[PDB]
Point group: C6
Chain length 75, copies 6
């Protein structure tokens, strides 16, 4: 039939708020997805470190390494 | 003789429910496989975080990074 | 002189029972190797989770991500 | 619309101070980004190991392996 | 001047006994290097699991995944 | 302006003593860099395992897997 490619899905999240779980991070990152590439490297702006709905640190602009991204969820 | 390629097997799971164990995740992810690519990145919909048959969190749409996928099992 | 390539060795295990240690798994996986690719992704059938000769969980069909495979041993 | 590629963002940080969280490191690295490549390997100069605003070790010149970089933040 | 490439060094170890430290393994692997490829996947024969000079498990034939190899040392 | 590529920096360390932190290693490796490749695999000679300025084990010749290298520092 048909299916939606992961890269297609992630690109559709550009300009929107997403939540990301990183392998080398205990808290999740929440911010606006400003850019992404085929290796799933992510560039977030207005980002913050969160533990669920609890904010723990303001980060602003950050770049996440794709091979260390575990899960991405539209917010 | 003959053999079934892993990528072939994973693609056959599209449209069906699968259980995934991630390297940077202590609980498994269960959801409908809506899309996958050659690097085994996975796009699940109607997903949930589970510990066996026990549901712990509703997630909805999520994208799993292929190099952090450990095991995939048809549900 | 001569040598046996790892990929050559793994392919020779197809159709046979193997034991696999995964980076993101504390127990080993034992099952029939039904398929493998150049990135060492593995497709096992009739698989089970074991701790040595002790069976802890029946799994059936599973796909193991190659970059998270640590060691493969013919059973 | 438009978006900023992660690699584009990281390159724009060259010549400036950045903070980096590594997967195999408990403390962050802070230093001047002197060079970077497409795999996000990083070359920092005048670097130091920090825990937030707390300096714990002087490092000087160091090269960080891209696949072990977790997060990069302009300082 | 000149230098010896890592892959060149590893290939020179073929046919000889080596000690390997794996990322997803607490004990080292010691065995005869029967084969290796450019991704540093390793095929050892007559292998054993060791903790220094202490043998803990006999393994025989095993294939080690290159990206999970940490250190290789001629024995 | 201009910048120094990480691979360029690492190659300039050939023939000199470097300190390396590995992801799957708790102690650092210190030795003479005899060879390196584009994936940052490293071949050290006269190497030793250290904890800062404290020597804990003599290693001699060792090959470090590039994707498990975390940080490299000229000694």
């Amino acid at each position: 039939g048909a299916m939606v490619l992961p890269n297609q899905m992630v690109k559709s999240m550009v300009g929107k708020i997403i939540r990301v779980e990183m392998k080398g991070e205990e808290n999740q990152l929440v911010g606006k997805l400003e850019g992404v590439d085929d290796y799933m490297n992510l560039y977030l702006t207005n980002a913050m470190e969160c533990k669920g709905e609890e904010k723990v640190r303001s980060l602003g602009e950050i770049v996440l390494r794709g091979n260390n991204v575990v899960l991405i969820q539209p917010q």
